[PDB]
Recover the amino acids of this structure.
């Protein structure tokens, strides 16, 4: 596809940007931090970034959000990252999952927050996605936990929403904001339309991606 | 300013992206091509990019558009680029102006188009700006030459518009599209609002930046 070529090329340019963001941090600090998002859109970005000759041993990688499922579950964000990003040179990166062996996120969240606080914040880069409903990470407009996620200084927050089929853990808005580079990576026309509506207003509860659109951000979009 | 810091940091990340885009091209081709825009917004991006250790001798630099004024005129885009981008390592780049010594752009445009056609298209990167009226390059919604600029295969087109005080030369939309990376670099709330409206519709004549929003593009914005 000319569509597929455009998305591939966009992802390669994004991988350049992120690799350089990491190198710039690694020139000043012992360790650097990369926060990524799941879904299908990041795949070519992960593959391109994974192949970069970078001091990956000094890079910590974690997720913007996660589903409360095992690491080998089809719906696991960690699985996608392991299979796509942590290969070749990037296999030397240290990945930090957002789960524990507790059967509920409520039981595991303190342990996860504790683990996140130990990483080298501010992140060199935070790579976000956006859903058709304007959500980002696991900040959902229909979640009763959204207000807490948008306001707390805690690193991670448990999230439930009628519109998603499993329980979630999200990094808080405050935590996700603590980065030198933010990227929103989205493709397709519907997401262009929703982003337009997001940019046009300021009510974060309505379209949570707005929490990041009022601060410096690079949006990478392709048809 | 925290505002100024945000814009500076955004520009540094953009400079990384553009430098890597150029290096990627230079790994495959003898010469690379960078197309930049004028105005105040690009300044910190030019300064950051200028300092990069890159094979600048193999890079051709030109403009997205230009005012029909001398190279030392306060309103010259070429002057801004020379004073800000073409310094230090980047002083070895070969700059290609969009003017001639003819007293009208109508008389000079063939010569300028001829000069542009000799450059290493597709560009490694095209860096665009956007005005409060939704214009980009010198593609103005109130110009009687807009339709020609949007449709012609000619490299450059003469442009007049009641809303700007001097005659212009713009690269055509077709020419500006011929690049592996497009960036829209904008700052401030008014431009966020106009971009939102641009993204929400498809009428290019109304908001000419729309000509580039339907293809892969990275938007770099800061408050
Ligand atoms: Na649910
Ligand atoms: Na005029």
């Amino acid at each position: 596809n000319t569509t597929q070529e455009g998305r591939q090329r966009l992802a390669e340019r994004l991988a350049d940007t992120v690799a350089q963001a990491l190198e710039a941090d690694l020139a000043k600090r012992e360790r650097a931090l990369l926060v990524v998002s799941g879904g299908s859109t990041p795949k070519p970005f992960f593959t391109s970034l994974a192949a970069k000759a970078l001091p990956w041993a000094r890079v910590d990688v974690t997720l913007a959000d996660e589903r409360w499922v095992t690491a080998d579950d089809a719906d696991s964000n960690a699985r996608l990252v392991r299979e796509t990003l942590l290969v070749g040179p990037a296999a030397e990166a240290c990945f930090h999952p957002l789960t524990t062996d507790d059967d509920t996120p409520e039981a595991g969240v303190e342990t996860v927050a504790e683990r996140l606080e130990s990483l080298p914040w501010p992140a060199s880069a935070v790579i976000l996605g956006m859903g058709g409903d304007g959500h980002t990470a696991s900040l959902f407009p229909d979640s009763e936990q959204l207000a807490t996620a948008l306001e707390t200084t805690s690193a991670a927050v448990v999230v439930h929403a009628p519109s998603v089929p499993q329980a979630r853990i999200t990094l808080s808005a405050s935590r996700l904001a603590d980065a030198g580079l933010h990227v929103l990576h989205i493709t397709g026309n519907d997401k262009r339309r929703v982003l337009a509506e997001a940019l046009a207003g300021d009510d974060v509860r309505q379209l949570p991606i707005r929490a990041f659109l009022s601060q410096p951000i690079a949006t990478y979009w392709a048809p």
About this structure: The interface with chain A takes residues 6-7, 9-10, 12-14, 16-17, 19-21, 24, 180-181, 192-193, 195-197, 199-200, 213-223 of chain B (CB under 8 Å). DSSP finds eight helices and nine strands in chain B. The domain at 1-223 of chain B is CATH 3.40.50.1360 (Rossmann fold).
